[PDB]
Design a binder for this molecule. Structure first.
Ligand code: COA
Ligand code: COA
Lengths: 187, 187
């Protein structure tokens, strides 16, 4: 098993790797949305996507810009690669507020899980948010991902104060019945 | 915190760093208790020890050979360091069959926990053992840790047969009480 960069695409949407070149149009975008992005410190400081781009060369993550032939509307990434299994996470996912409520997320998740399950041949896909990020929480739960539990004192917010973290999973068995409820709102 | 090699001791029990010369005695001792270790990936492969020695220099694990006065009696390690909080894992624990229920673990645990929580001023210590691993699950419950959740499809046993894991964690508010007992324990 290895994770090589891939470009994922469904209709109007295009998922490509975070190149250097994008950090700019990615950054001030984040500054437009400094309200919706407050449960994931590491927003407008562009040391974030360089940390982002870094991880890849180590082989640690595979990190994505989300687009509609631009404009970038946000970013997501695979990471926490566990090849014995194999398994991965999704996370570091955020989107211009205009894209919320719109099912863009759903489109992103479907392309990434299908890749993860049907192509990487994985058995577990992690997804964690914060105990206080109820928006992120329902989203994952609209995705049909089992809530394995909250991990007390697991993160600090954009204020440097502690928060517990929720943790979800979707096994290899889960994937057909996950895949197909996305293929539902998508219709 | 800085994860520096440290020697902790309690009576006839000296947990001291792992050096490359211990590894040959540790693979041996492991093949002895080959059956009592089936719920763990790694332990009969010398390079699973080497791997912790290596990440000792990368800062990702401090790694302990457990001795009973003089006999190399087991291993147990620290890992999954999250500094931004900070918080740690304990794991990689295994003792030769003969010292099970003979009270050595409790002591190997207090020692580290007291190090991880009073010296390291940590806020979260997490442990995970196998869903199929029933002794381990009682032993962690005897510490005072909270069962945070089953984690499906998350691990493999010596067979390689997939399995689930159980997250247990202890925060700092829970320490005082956990220290306490493990002093009641010993008293
Ligand atoms: C989460 C994010 C993708 C927004 O996604 P999204 O497109 O709005 O997801 P959805 O469109 O399905 O809607 C989210 C759900 O949360 C609901 N919701 C939003 N705010 C809510 C609130 N205070 N309370 C309760 N529910 C709320 C929404 O109403 C919606 O549920 P609904 O259909 O019942 O109305 C992103 O914008 C973000 O800012 N941070 C994510 C950080 C993270 O955790 N990343 C890792 C997870 S992959
Ligand atoms: C650690 C290990 C050596 C067990 O040793 P131990 O720590 O001495 O066990 P302890 O005596 O501490 O506690 C075990 C207790 O659970 C009980 N127990 C529960 N279910 C049991 C079972 N199926 N078989 C045996 N004992 C069981 C034991 O009787 C014992 O006494 P008590 O519960 O009545 O007081 C070993 O089983 C192992 O393989 N470890 C896996 C390590 C791992 O992955 N976890 C890492 C996180 S530390």
């Amino acid at each position: 098993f290895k994770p090589q960069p891939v470009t994922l695409r469904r209709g109007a949407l295009c998922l490509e790797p975070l190149a250097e070149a994008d950090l700019v149009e990615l950054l001030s975008l984040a500054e437009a949305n400094r309200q919706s992005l407050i449960y994931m410190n590491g927003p407008l400081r562009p040391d974030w996507y360089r940390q982002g781009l870094a991880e890849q060369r180590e082989g640690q993550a595979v990190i994505y810009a989300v687009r509609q032939d631009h404009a970038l509307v946000g970013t997501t990434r695979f990471f926490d690669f566990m090849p014995g299994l194999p398994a991965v996470e999704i996370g570091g996912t955020w989107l211009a507020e205009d894209r919320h409520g719109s099912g863009l997320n759903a489109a992103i998740k479907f392309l990434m899980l299908r890749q993860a399950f049907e192509q990487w041949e994985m058995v577990r896909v992690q997804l964690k948010t914060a105990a206080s990020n109820l928006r992120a929480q329902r989203a994952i739960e609209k995705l049909g991902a089992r809530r394995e539990g909250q991990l007390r004192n697991h993160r600090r917010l954009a204020d440097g104060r502690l928060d517990d973290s929720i943790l979800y999973s979707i096994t290899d068995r889960d994937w057909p019945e996950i895949r197909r409820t996305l293929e539902t709102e998508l219709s």
